[PDB]
């Protein structure tokens, strides 16, 4: 049985950067409704492969990766934020940030891009790819989970979908992105990425 | 030479079902910005195409769909509402609808259902199928606009874009589409339908 | 679970219109190889439901539905072809085939354009809409299936992967659409019809 | 106005490991056929381009990526094989790999296991990221062209399309993979791979 997770902060502890309104909204509302429908859907699939029924399989994907992958999504995004974030990261993240994209500013630009790219619903994402052994900056469509439709690892998402940031910038998708890097919790993420030194 | 087409009322003129600021961002905007980006991409195409550049035609394409879907919409979108509008169509429409989804009522549930059940950003639609000469429901993505993408002629749709209900109706989408039942333009719908039948 | 049905004839049954090797690959190897691979992805689904790895769920779902859609669409097929075959149906599937099309040239004309339309690997449908309660064409690439990709209930398929002609007919697709009306089973085209009935 | 580019060399010149037959239809009726639909959509988006016709636009966007990206590919595929081919390349290029690969061996393994991975139609790619500046491994769908999808320069392109290889190795696609290593112009792939060091 999943559960919506609790916040790592309260609502407003993102203020100004992302408002409490949004927080609250995206958490309670939007995080909370891809929770309660993707165990819906987990129940009926149990019921589905147990009876070897292959079309009610195949006509239950689009809600289990719509909902499942908004519940990995929400959960992971949560955690790459924090009111004591911002700032740059240190140590081996800096420094693969550096090899990887020159540099932290240039990482920025990069992941900004992917991030105000995205055309209609979405997600920009900072991986790590396993077999490469290095980082990888990505673009996943409305909740398409970054693991299980690319295979890399998550360490950093930021969430593009118009209830992440209409409230307070409405079609201004950049100055929302221009924000959201105070926001950070650059240990999450490094705790991410250190947990792909395995 | 594309041209971002006035409203044909105020924007505060679907109050209460849809607010001003909507309106006012919806169309000085979201349309606008397509307006323009469709008419940099039909010169940036018409370069390529020149010059035999199947590679720049080929990258051109999510723009030219997202962009040049984003005017076609959003144009047939206006003429769809109106201070005026609500209540039932009349004569063949009317009939069309009964014959084809049983009653209006059976319609407004399998439209409202297309619409609520778009999972990202997307539109929901009433069509025309030339080919079987009847009505048809279809829900496109993003800005995939009907015809070009299915080949059915645009009677009415309903924008399900997030920015389209957000500030006013947050999460509950299904409140929006409730209420832009209220402002249907039938005269609009009435008259795209019979040229289907000139 | 699932296991690869018999042929309701011989691999040499509907010579010269489908040649024996291709009927032979086609079920031995092809169609084979979707059920080996549908009973192993569903056992891995039934472990990753079990331990809540939405992660794992999400990454087998192209396998799933790729050789879930294969069984599925190949199993149909099967049925769908006989060396007594050819002709046109009657009854009750063909006064529909009349009222939806036309009649039953145009059926074919459309079903074959469907098929041929196909870009790539998939499949062409004849199928029946029970929203509707009428017939309706429908293309679908690779091994969507049919009714858990639409919800189209089928009737009738064509497999247009070129691996079910190209031995025989190498590239010239049409010849091999306009050499199958020759044995399509109507008497299990008419049955599936009557089952929608119901 | 897009011709049929002449083979490098004759139709029997790969033998055995990519049969005359195979080589004399993909070249003079596959690729012949993209080349002629590609001039014929071309034109038609020209006057749809003239006129202001999005819904043409769009509606012809399907045709011309496939096409184009038909003859791009083709045009790319016959180049980078050779009877002088196989073995492993000289110079940067073996070097190159071996950064990003780890070894040749292991790169051999990628490539085959992207290319086998293509469920349906599709082809392999062995491409070059400019902005990361570092050899990168792709899978395209259909005829969906490397560098107008993805941003990549294609550098050796493996076509999976079942005509590619169907009449000598049946469904045993892997035995082709296999088999076409040995016929690799590393000459041309280094000359595209120079030409991306500018
Ligand atoms: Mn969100
Ligand atoms: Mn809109
Ligand atoms: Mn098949
Ligand atoms: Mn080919």
Same mark, same amino acid.
């Given at each position: 049985?999943?559960?919506?997770?609790?916040?790592?902060?309260?609502?407003?502890?993102?203020?100004?950067?992302?408002?409490?309104?949004?927080?609250?909204?995206?958490?309670?509302?939007?995080?909370?409704?891809?929770?309660?429908?993707?165990?819906?859907?987990?129940? /009926?699939?149990? +019921?589905? &492969?147990?009876?070897?029924? #292959?079309?009610? !399989?195949?006509?239950?994907?689009?809600? @289990?990766? %719509? $909902?499942?992958?908004?519940?990995?999504?929400?959960?992971?995004?949560?955690?790459?934020?924090?009111?004591?974030?911002?700032?740059?990261?240190?140590?081996?993240?800096?420094?693969?940030?550096?090899?990887?994209?020159?540099?932290?500013? /240039?990482?920025? +630009?990069? &992941?900004?891009?992917?991030? #105000?790219?995205? !055309?209609?619903?979405?997600?920009?994402? @900072?991986? %790590? $790819?396993?077999?490469?052994?290095?980082?990888?900056?990505?673009?996943?469509?409305?909740?398409?989970?970054?693991?299980?439709?690319?295979?890399?690892?998550?360490?950093?998402?930021?969430?593009?979908?118009?209830?992440?940031?209409?409230?307070?910038?409405?079609?201004?998708?950049?100055?929302?992105?221009?924000?959201?890097?105070?926001?950070?919790?650059?240990?999450?993420?490094?705790?991410?990425?250190?947990?792909?030194?395995?």
């Amino acid at each position: 049985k999943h559960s919506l997770p609790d916040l790592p902060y309260d609502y407003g502890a993102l203020e100004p950067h992302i408002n409490a309104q949004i927080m609250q909204l995206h958490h309670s509302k939007h995080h909370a409704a891809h929770v309660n429908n993707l165990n819906v859907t987990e129940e /009926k699939y149990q +019921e589905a &492969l147990a009876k070897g029924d #292959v079309t009610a !399989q195949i006509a239950l994907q689009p809600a @289990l990766k %719509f $909902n499942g992958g908004g519940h990995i999504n929400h959960s992971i995004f949560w955690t790459n934020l924090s009111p004591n974030g911002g700032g740059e990261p240190k140590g081996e993240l800096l420094e693969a940030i550096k090899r990887d994209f020159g540099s932290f500013d /240039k990482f920025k +630009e990069k &992941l900004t891009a992917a991030s #105000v790219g995205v !055309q209609g619903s979405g997600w920009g994402w @900072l991986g %790590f $790819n396993k077999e490469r052994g290095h980082l990888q900056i990505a673009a996943c469509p409305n909740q398409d989970p970054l693991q299980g439709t690319t295979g890399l690892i998550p360490l950093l998402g930021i969430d593009v979908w118009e209830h992440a940031y209409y409230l307070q910038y409405k079609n201004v998708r950049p100055d929302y992105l221009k924000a959201i890097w105070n926001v950070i919790n650059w240990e999450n993420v490094t705790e991410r990425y250190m947990a792909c030194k395995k």
